[PDB]
Design a protein around this ligand. Structure first.
Ligand SMILES: *[C@@H]1O[C@H](CO)[C@@H](O[C@@H]2O[C@H](CO)[C@@H](O)[C@H](O)[C@H]2NC(C)=O)[C@H](O)[C@H]1NC(C)=O
Lengths: 107, 126, 51, 151, 50
């Protein structure tokens, strides 16, 4: 169905740095992109839903935006705790799909 | 408040049937009007969506599993279950159940997964 | 309600979408505002009637 | 704007597209040095700089070399990593005389396409009022070449 | 009507640039005629030449 391409495959950034991770959809997914944070040993946590809305309890350092076919996850003021794989989820159609997962390492 | 818990056999032999059960707690499975999902992670690989069931029996699946998968729920126990036939090495994964919520939006309900269970590992081996 | 546009009609597709989203905002606003204004008056109405 | 009198098709549509663009990476796709069969050094007084006839900096006005105009061909497979904007155009001389001294061939055409684009245009050779000193017109068109597609 | 068959009509201004050719073909009769006439228009600006 609609495939998701996530890039970079991995990031490395220092504490206090700002980084971005992007999602590219093969089709128009009209503001139906969700972002998830997966820490080792845990089920993925929802960070951002409907392209730019933060889930309750998500730190203010996380934000994002986008439009048809292109979305960005921005993480400012990276802390040692923000170590995770980040995933792109496309909720637009029924056979829901995910991107590959970006691995972000904190220094 | 909402928690999802999972259990299963742990070990499945090749060509046997894999069967997992998710128990929903703090969220009536039959009243919320929400969709219940199964997702898994194979070693190395990222998240793969398996399928979902509505609060009623309407069920959808990832087409790659169309010859092998069945999903059902028992309202009486607030439980979801996943069944995969002809299980092989490729099916080793951490399985997770999750709840699908929504935001009313300009394009229709905008769905997301807020509550996830802890998941469980199923190993397929001889 | 739904319409389809070609890839060379982005200006029109956006006009159409803006129109539909615009009316949705107007009606969502009117529906929510009317419910809130009326609930305030309904409760005042009932307290007034008991008095 | 256009130093050489002309028109730009779907110009309003391109300006709309740019409302969704924050940055372009300009990529050389068809280095002008590849057109070994054509003159790539033409221009006009209308675009002249300090008295020297010139032309638009990101485009190649292909004209006759020696005594002929071999069919001009080229393509790009868009391996740049993202969807690319490509602009090209058609010259419209104001007289057969101009068409002949620039191209030799008169019954010419320009054909462009992709997996979704299919266009063929011919020049309109005719007298028109002068604009910026020229009785000629140049018509520009554009397309978005998708990823891994070939123009 | 015209002697020439491979004809064209060319019209232009500082902003208008059009060339049309006739379409010679059988069509249903309308008002007794199997022919059609196509009209176009432009606004000629001040001091411009058509
Ligand atoms: C344009 O470049 C792409 C990338 O190299 C070529 O597509 C690849 O073709 C091979 C087979 O020869 C496949 O195994 C790859 O999976 C393809 N890659 C991608 C990203 O699709 C493509 O063939 C090239 N172009 C043309 C016009 O023939």
């Amino acid at each position: 169905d609609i495939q998701m391409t996530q890039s970079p495959s991995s990031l490395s950034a220092s504490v206090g740095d700002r980084v971005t991770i992007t999602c590219r959809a093969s089709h128009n997914i009209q503001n139906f992109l969700n972002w998830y944070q997966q820490k080792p040993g845990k089920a993925p946590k929802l960070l951002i839903y409907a392209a730019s809305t933060l889930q309750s309890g998500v730190p203010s350092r996380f934000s994002g935006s986008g439009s048809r076919t292109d979305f960005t996850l921005t993480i400012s003021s990276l802390q040692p705790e923000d170590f995770a794989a980040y995933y792109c989820q496309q909720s637009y159609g029924l056979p829901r799909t995910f991107g590959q997962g970006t691995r972000l390492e904190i220094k | 408040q909402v928690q999802l818990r999972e259990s299963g056999p742990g070990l499945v032999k090749p060509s046997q049937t894999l069967s997992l059960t998710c128990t929903v707690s703090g969220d009536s499975i039959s009243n919320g009007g929400l969709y219940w999902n199964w997702i898994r992670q194979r070693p190395g690989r990222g998240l793969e969506w398996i399928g979902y069931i509505y609060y009623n029996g309407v069920t959808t699946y990832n087409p790659s599993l169309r010859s092998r998968i069945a999903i059902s729920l028992e309202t009486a126990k607030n439980q979801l279950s996943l069944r995969l036939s002809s299980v092989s090495a490729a099916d080793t994964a951490i399985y997770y159940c999750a709840r699908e919520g929504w935001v009313p939006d300009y394009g229709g309900r905008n769905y997301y997964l807020d509550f996830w269970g802890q998941g469980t590992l199923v190993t397929v081996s001889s | 309600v739904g319409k389809e546009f070609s890839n060379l009609e982005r200006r029109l597709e956006n006009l159409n979408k803006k129109m539909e989203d615009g009316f949705l905002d107007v009606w969502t606003y009117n529906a929510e505002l009317l419910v809130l204004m009326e609930n305030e008056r309904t409760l005042d109405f009932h307290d007034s009637n008991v008095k | 704007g256009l130093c050489y009198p002309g028109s730009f098709n779907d110009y309003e549509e391109l300006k709309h597209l740019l409302s969704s663009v924050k940055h372009f990476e300009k990529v050389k796709i068809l280095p002008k040095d590849r057109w070994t069969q054509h003159t790539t050094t033409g221009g006009s007084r209308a675009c002249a700089v300090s008295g020297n006839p010139s032309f638009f900096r990101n485009m190649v006005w292909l004209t006759k070399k020696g005594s002929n105009y071999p069919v001009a061909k080229g393509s790009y497979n868009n391996t740049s990593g993202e969807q690319m904007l490509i602009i090209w155009g058609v010259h419209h001389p104001n007289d057969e005389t101009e068409q002949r001294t620039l191209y030799q061939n008169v019954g010419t055409y320009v054909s462009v396409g992709t997996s979704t684009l299919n266009k063929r245009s011919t020049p309109d050779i005719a007298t028109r009022p002068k604009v910026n000193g020229q009785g000629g017109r140049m018509e520009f068109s554009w397309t978005l070449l998708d990823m891994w597609d070939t123009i």
